[PDB]
Amino acid sequence: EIKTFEQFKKVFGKVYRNAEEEARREHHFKEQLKWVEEHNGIDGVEYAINEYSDMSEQEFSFHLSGGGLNFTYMKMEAAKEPLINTYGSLPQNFDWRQKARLTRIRQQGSCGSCWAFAAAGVAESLYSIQKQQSIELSEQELVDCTYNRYDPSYQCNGCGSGYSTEAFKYMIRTGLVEERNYPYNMRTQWCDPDVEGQRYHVSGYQQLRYHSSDEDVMYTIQQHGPVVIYMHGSNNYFRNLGNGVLRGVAYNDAYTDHAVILVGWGTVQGVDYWIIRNSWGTGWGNGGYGYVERGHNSLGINNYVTYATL
Ligand SMILES: *[C@@H]1O[C@H](CO)[C@@H](O)[C@H](O)[C@H]1NC(C)=O
Numbered sequence: 001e002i003k004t005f006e007q008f009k010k011v012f013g014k015v016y017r018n019a020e021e022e023a024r025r026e027h028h029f030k031e032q033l034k035w036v037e038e039h040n041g042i043d044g045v046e047y048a049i050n051e052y053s054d055m056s057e058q059e060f061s062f063h064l065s066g067g068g069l070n071f072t073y074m075k076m077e078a079a080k081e082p083l084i085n086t087y088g089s090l091p092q093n094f095d096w097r098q099k100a101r102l103t104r105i106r107q108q109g110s111c112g113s114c115w116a117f118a119a120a121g122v123a124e125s126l127y128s129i130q131k132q133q134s135i136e137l138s139e140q141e142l143v144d145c146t147y148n149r150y151d152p153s154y155q156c157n158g159c160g161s162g163y164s165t166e167a168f169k170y171m172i173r174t175g176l177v178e179e180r181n182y183p184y185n186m187r188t189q190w191c192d193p194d195v196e197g198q199r200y201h202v203s204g205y206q207q208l209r210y211h212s213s214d215e216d217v218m219y220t221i222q223q224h225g226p227v228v229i230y231m232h233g234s235n236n237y238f239r240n241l242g243n244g245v246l247r248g249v250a251y252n253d254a255y256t257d258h259a260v261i262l263v264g265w266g267t268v269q270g271v272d273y274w275i276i277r278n279s280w281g282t283g284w285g286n287g288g289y290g291y292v293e294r295g296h297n298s299l300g301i302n303n304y305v306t307y308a309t310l
């Protein structure tokens, strides 16, 4: 129910370092609100304003990944082959939200940390799935302690941009303490390594072949749990997604700037979709979850799929 800027301002409590900045800012909100009203309900899909609606597509994309994702680096670590192709048949519907008590939806806020939330999310899922333990891990510890300037053995850039594979690497070698012990501030800080508290590890991770088939991905999800994917988060349709199944968007997209989690799949009246766990609060999508059509590498969903192992 946000009709122009300072309802948006007081709802999301936005402070502006300047008056020059606000002028450049409600125009983007107006044109984002413009995009929302003209698209809401089309193809029976809900779109809606959110905390990010004051940035342009260019700005938001930079907000997510600081224009600095080395795809060459990301492609090099992938498996080179599809899965051994002997797994039987796949169920039409599969939803880890129903097979396990997954942890609550998180909110990365004004920090390009999706890579950290996606990795932590997969790890938390696995602890629920294999041990029936609900834990909340510290994304902030990932942001700071995989920071390249802090530890050159890692390639992440904090709130700038990052790699979920690098995050899992950290979860193997060091492990993460819980949120309580290293709380989230949506900013790059100096790594605190003398944080005590129990540490939660994974033992391994594997990135699937670039452009993996839906079937490989679905099977991976079935056998290894929720998976990290990298996709085109700053796309207008995905950006403002509420309820509904996003169809016909960005087929075979090569441009990726956002990390999220696949937790399953389903079919609704002829339409095959993915279930996406996002890190933008329960206000986005349907309670923080979104639905994107399968079968077309929509928004680059199949480009960089990674699972982990406890
Ligand atoms: C990207 O990564 C590749 C392989 O790790 C490296 O050779 C290249 O120099 C990197 N480029 C940039 C711009 O970081």
Ligand SMILES: [Cl-]
Pocket (backbone or CB within 6 Å): 169, 172, 173
């Ligand atoms: Cl390692």
Ligand SMILES: [Cl-]
Pocket (backbone or CB within 6 Å): 159, 186, 187, 188
């Ligand atoms: Cl920062």
